RNA sequence: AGCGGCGAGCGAACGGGGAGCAGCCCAGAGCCUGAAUCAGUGUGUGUGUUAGUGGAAGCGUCUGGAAAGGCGCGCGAUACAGGGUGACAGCCCCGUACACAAAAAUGCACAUGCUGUGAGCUCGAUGAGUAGGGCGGGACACGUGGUAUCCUGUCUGAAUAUGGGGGGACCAUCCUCCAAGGCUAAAUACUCCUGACUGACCGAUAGUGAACCAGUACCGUGAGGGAAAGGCGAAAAGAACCCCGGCGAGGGGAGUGAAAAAGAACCUGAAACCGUGUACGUACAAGCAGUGGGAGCACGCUUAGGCGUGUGACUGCGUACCUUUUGUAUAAUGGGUCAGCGACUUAUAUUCUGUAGCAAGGUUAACCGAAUAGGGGAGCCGAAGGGAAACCGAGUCUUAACUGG
Ligand SMILES: N[C@@H](Cc1c[nH]c2ccccc12)C(=O)O
Ligand SMILES: [Mg+2]
Ligand SMILES: [Mg+2]
Ligand SMILES: [Mg+2]
């Protein structure tokens with residue numbers, strides 16, 4: 005499936 | 021022209037426009053090609069992606085898998101997927117105008133007379149349906165690869181020549197450009213000459 | 222009529238790889254890298270036919286300069302003397318003489334000096 | 339003349355475009371469609387008469403006229419056909435039987451086109467001035 | 483299948499002898515009090531389709 | 547033609563050419579005999595169907611493991627369709643053309659008994675909550691529009707042969723048919739299944755998902771999804787026996803075989819990838835790794851002359867390919883590599899070009915024909931245009947008319 009650090013929100017939305 | 025017999029050693033008159041026009045290779049080729057295309061059967065089919073057995077489920081979700089996106093298991097890219105432009109049963113026959121067909125036969129007959137591949141005989145028959153008897157008579161005439169046209173359909177001659185694969189026997193009305201061009205010698209009876217010149221006008 | 226592509230595909234790939242014989246590693250093994258190398262080899266070969274003509278003229282100029290300076294005149298004045306004495310021996314032959322026959326080159330230098338003087 | 343000595347005419351068998359088969363063919367990669375856009379998309383293009391959203395010509399011009407079924411069932415006849423008819427008497431049913439006009443044409447007219455040289459009688463058809471003069475010069479008769 | 487004629491285009495254009503198309507002039511439907519008489523008289527007769535539009539007109543009428 | 551936010555699009559009929567042809571009964575009484583025509587049940591004659599029988603004609607020699615192949619010489623053919631046999635067979639085998647065969651069951655077309663049914667003639671009758679109408683919808687190519695016609699959810703409602711319906715709003719004249727009961731073969735549509743034949747159809751990533759014990763293994767609670775996997779050899783003659791080894795796995799001899807460079811992980815055996823040996827290079831040397839020049843070394847040499855092959859010290863130049871861009875070495879995109887697959891096709895219609903036929907003509911479609919022949923000219927395009935149209939016609943329209951346009 006998918007990696008947890010890609011599902012996470014604090015590190016994915018790192019540069020809004 | 022005048023055609024010289026060999027069994028009777030006589031002469032027979034035939035039409036200028038039927039047995040003496042030039043060989044028009046483009047028309048003759050077009051009619052020969054159209055005969056072959058009409059001989060095509062054309063029965064085949066392949067399966068498109070509408071027809072391969074399988075489901076319409078997306079193999080994996082659109083984004084996040086890391087794989088190149090796919091939307092159907094029946095895709096023509098995939099192994100065991102359908103053909104992209106799969107062929108269907110189609111009609112391969114072509115139209116020939118009647119005057120082009122008649123011009124092609126006239127040119128073919130004129131070229132046969134010009135290269136002296138057409139032997140005119142007065143009568144051509146066998147007593148009994150014996151292939152041995154017909155083979156002996158053709159070896160007497162010194163012919164091997166021969167198309168024999170006859171004005172009336174003779175059962176004995178047809179049964180005799182059914183088994184010789186280099187010898188064919190045809191009625192007057194059933195001649196065709198591929199057979200006339202392909203067979204090495206053509207043997208015309210006088211009745212067949214009359215019928216052919218009549219139907220060609 | 223289904224067409225299978227194995228024979229033709231193998232032939233094209235082997236043609237490229239036989240051309241790429243001698244290169245380092247995947248450039249001589251792997252077809253993609255070999256194809257990218259053979260094209261660059263052809264481009265370099267074309268450009269270096271031109272550069273070969275330039276480089277060899279450069280080498281002949283250097284050798285004529287060295288031999289003329291040994292005989293007591295610069296290359297430019299030596300060539301001016303030859304073009305003024307109307308001698309049409311080109312630079313390839315002049316460097317050849319300057320290496321192998323020093324007496325003939327001494328005669329040529331004397332002729333050029335006489336033409337300038 | 340064999341099956342392997344026949345060849346077509348020169349210039350009659352030009353081979354079709356094969357789009358997308360390498361650089362050297364001149365049709366490789368994009369295949370004659372340019373770069374991107376609706377016209378290079380598969381199945382892309384606009385319909386007939388579309389002008390980008392501007393009102394098309396067939397909608398900014400005004401309609402006119404109407405259609406006449408009498409004009410649909412009336413035909414005109416050349417003097418050459420007048421000579422080609424069979425029997426020497428020219429009527430509506432004789433023309434229909436001689437295949438000059440179709441079966442549903444009721445009114446006919448003879449016009450000055452071609453030439454007549456055979457004396458024929460025209461009955462029951464409107465005849466123009468030039469056609470009347472030509473028929474009467476050739477030696478015919480015009481009924482009413 | 484047969485090509486289908488654009489029916490509005492068929493109602494608005496008729497073909498002429500040498501292959502051109504004739505059409506009726508626009509701007510003669512209303513606001514005719516403030517239009518001038520010279521302009522209306524010159525808009526009255528039928529006209530010909532130009533070179534910039536013959537391609538579109540033929541593409542809309544395959545059976546004319 | 548028409549319908550159409552008169553848009554996108556939808557799209558007839560009249561009439562013409564063919565395939566196929568078939569008409570009747572009740573709404574009712576009388577003379578008459580049960581008569582035509584249909585169903586079941588039997589009985590005979592053909593034709594089949596379900597098993598089958600006969601079915602022609604070749605030897606020698608050379609290569610070869612093997613002859614069907616080469617060479618020479620014969621024979622059959624109403625049989626040279628096809629398959630097999632140690633390599634490609636008319637004459638070795640199974641077959642094929644052809645001629646026959648049915649105790650028993652059954653299909654069809656006839657003919658003939660029984661049962662049920664009634665024909666022929668005369669007179670009479672002519673399908674009522676129906677046609678039509680108001681309101682709401684639907685079907686007709688017809689989207690309520692000037693809308694005919696058909697169907698009916700609701701509300702009404704005639705005439706009834708001296709009558710009624712239709713002829714595209716509607717009225718009058720004329721024409722043509724008789725609703726409110728029903729039955730009817732053929733031409734037509736399809737193929738889960740059966741037999742034969744065919745293929746410019748595929749040949750194990752193809753063709754069915756499935757050439758193989760495949761809707762299997764496996765996956766899901768379930769509906770459901772759904773694979774991979776063909777080949778020794780001609781014949782198993784599938785390796786007796788001996789040696790190393792754990793009474794192994796694996797191997798080497800021996801043996802069979804034409805071949806084990808076919809040993810069951812088996813025809814051929816590519817590339818990536820991994821090694822062993824030989825020649826050359828490389829441990830003071832900087833970068834798309836090549837290219838131009840180039841010494842030395844090693845090996846072949848056949849004019850003893852230099853050449854050829856492998857390497858490449860040193861050296862000038864030299865920032866990959868695709869894409870997308872004004873512009874990429876770009877630190878923008880894609881790709882770990884190999885092998886196989888993967889993307890402008892098909893049908894119908896229309897315009898232009900080339901070429902071929904005929905030429906003021908050209909050409910047929912469906913269908914008949916066993917017929918790629920021939921018939922079929924129904925039609926379509928062209929030889930005449932102008933006008934919105936009637937209409938006129940080498941002219942026409944505009945206009946009262948054009949010097950005109
Ligand atoms: N990283 C933690 C938490 C986690 C689980 N799934 C996730 C999805 C998104 C973000 C975080 C998580 C884990 O592996 O248990
Ligand atoms: Mg497939
Ligand atoms: Mg025909
Ligand atoms: Mg194949």
Ligand SMILES: [Mg+2]
Nearest residue numbers: 238249250251
């Ligand atoms: Mg290698």
Ligand SMILES: [Mg+2]
Nearest residue numbers: 363364365366
């Ligand atoms: Mg280009």
Ligand SMILES: [Mg+2]
Nearest residue numbers: 372373374375
């Ligand atoms: Mg752009």
Ligand SMILES: [Mg+2]
Nearest residue numbers: 368373374869
């Ligand atoms: Mg692109």
Ligand SMILES: [Mg+2]
Nearest residue numbers: 372374375377
């Ligand atoms: Mg574009």
Ligand SMILES: [Mg+2]
Nearest residue numbers: 379380381382
């Ligand atoms: Mg698409």
Ligand SMILES: [Mg+2]
Nearest residue numbers: 437439440441
């Ligand atoms: Mg006609």
Ligand SMILES: [Mg+2]
Nearest residue numbers: 510511512514
């Ligand atoms: Mg107005």
Ligand SMILES: [Mg+2]
Nearest residue numbers: 601602640641
């Ligand atoms: Mg036999």
Ligand SMILES: [Mg+2]
Nearest residue numbers: 607613614615
């Ligand atoms: Mg032999």
Ligand SMILES: [Mg+2]
Nearest residue numbers: 612632633780
């Ligand atoms: Mg073999």
Ligand SMILES: [Mg+2]
Nearest residue numbers: 672673724725
């Ligand atoms: Mg009634």
Ligand SMILES: [Mg+2]
Nearest residue numbers: 677678679698
């Ligand atoms: Mg009603």
Ligand SMILES: [Mg+2]
Nearest residue numbers: 678679693694
């Ligand atoms: Mg009404």
Ligand SMILES: [Mg+2]
Nearest residue numbers: 677695711725
């Ligand atoms: Mg009614």
Ligand SMILES: [Mg+2]
Nearest residue numbers: 694695712713
């Ligand atoms: Mg009415």
